[PDB]
Every structure is written in structure tokens, then in C-alpha cells.
């Protein structure tokens, strides 16, 4: 123990940072969408905001066992001072992170560029959205670089409401 609060709080952001990274790399085939860490007495808690907790759970309670053990071994928690809890999310149509990895999972699954983008926007919109946007930057087949935009409905682009309403 014994760490300046500064170095404590900073380190806690780095903690989360590395955490979400690892989850983002390990639970993509489940539309994983983020994490929150609950510090308590007796235990340190971790919630796995994903869309698909029946795969994260695993047969009679494995994989979550594996993910714990993993995360435990790394940050060197004593078996039982860390707890991992999977959780469905509320309609994945309003998480930027869920749809991006869906698009990823559209074109990686061999589909038209406009069918992927437009279908995604029609779901997110259908999910009670004020507005939705998708930018595809890169190169498909054609040699020369290109990019596309795919907006719908209402969004603002500036100011604090950004810190209030849009997810990027």
C-alpha cells in the first residue's frame, strides 16, 4: 500500500484502461461493451457489461472462472479478493461500442458496405435514437483510398452536449 492519492487515482485510471483493453480484445465475439469496478471491503469487484452472458458464463460456470483467474493472476489478487460479474446491457442499439464491433462483424462476415452501414443505422435508429452516424474509412477492392459517411436523423456536433449526448 502507501501511495500518494494522486498516484493512486491516476493508477486507477490506468487500471481501468488496461482492463477495458483486455476485455475489448477477449470478448469481441460477444458484443462486450464496457466495464465497471466496485471497490469494497473484503472483495474487489468487476462487472462485464456485454450483450451475451451465456457464452461468457461458459459450461457449468467456466470461462468467467478463466477470465477471473487471468485478471487475478496479472494484478496479483489473492484468490477471492477479486470478483467478476457478467451482465446484459440495455438494448445494444444505443452503445457505440456494440455497433462498431457489429459492423466489424458485418464486413468481416462478407457483406455489402452499404447494407452493413445502412442496416446498422436502421437498427440503432429503430432503438429510439435521436441520430446515428457511421464513417467507413479505408479501401475496399479498389486500389485508391476512399471513405463514406452514413448519417440519419438528428445529432449535434459541438459543445458540451457532446459530453452529454453523443457516443463515439
Amino acid at each position: 500500500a502507501l501511495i500518494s492519492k494522486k498516484r493512486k487515482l491516476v493508477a486507477d485510471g490506468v487500471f481501468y484502461a488496461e482492463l477495458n483493453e483486455f476485455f475489448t480484445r477477449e470478448l469481441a465475439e460477444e458484443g462486450y461493451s464496457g466495464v465497471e469496478v466496485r471497490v469494497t471491503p473484503t472483495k474487489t469487484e468487476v462487472i462485464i457489461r456485454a450483450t451475451r452472458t451465456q457464452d461468457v458464463l461458459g459450461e457449468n460456470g467456466r470461462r468467467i472462472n478463466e477470465l477471473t483467474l487471468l485478471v487475478q493472476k496479472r494484478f496479483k489478487y489473492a484468490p477471492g479478493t477479486i470478483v467478476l460479474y457478467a451482465e446484459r446491457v440495455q438494448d445494444r442499439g444505443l452503445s457505440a461500442v456494440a455497433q462498431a464491433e457489429s459492423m466489424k462483424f458485418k464486413l468481416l462476415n462478407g457483406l455489402a458496405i452499404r447494407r452493413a452501414a445502412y442496416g446498422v443505422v436502421r437498427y440503432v435508429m429503430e432503438s429510439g435514437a435521436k441520430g446515428c452516424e457511421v464513417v467507413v474509412s479505408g479501401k475496399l477492392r479498389a486500389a485508391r483510398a476512399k471513405a463514406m459517411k452514413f448519417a440519419d436523423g438528428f445529432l449535434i456536433h459541438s459543445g458540451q452536449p457532446v459530453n452529454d449526448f453523443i457516443d463515439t
Binding site: 487515482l9 491516476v10 485510471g13 490506468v14 481501468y16 484502461a17
Partner: protein, 53 residues
């Protein structure tokens, strides 16, 4: 066994690196975070630094 494959790494730029990308160059060291400025901006929101002024 092999007394022939390392040498002092106890200060200077070569001793440390980046906890994300191993990159020695551009290391922001403040607050014991030790992540490179190119990495720090991609994560600063996820960490806790944000843009106000």
C-alpha cells in the same frame, strides 16, 4: 547460465518503456503512469484526464 546477454538498465531512456507499446520514446512519466504521449491521448479519457480548458 549465459553471462553474456544484458547490461545496465537502471536509468536513462533505455531502462523504462511504455506499459502499452514498449516504446521508449515520448514517454510521459508524471504521476507514475509511465505511458507514451502517443498512447496517453488515446487512453486519457478511459483513464481520467479530460478536456476542459
Amino acid at each position: 547460465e549465459n553471462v553474456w546477454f544484458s547490461h545496465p538498465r537502471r536509468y536513462g531512456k533505455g531502462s523504462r518503456q511504455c506499459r502499452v507499446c514498449s516504446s521508449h520514446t515520448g514517454l510521459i512519466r508524471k504521476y507514475g503512469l509511465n505511458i507514451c504521449r502517443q498512447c496517453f491521448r488515446e487512453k486519457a479519457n478511459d483513464i481520467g484526464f479530460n478536456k476542459f480548458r
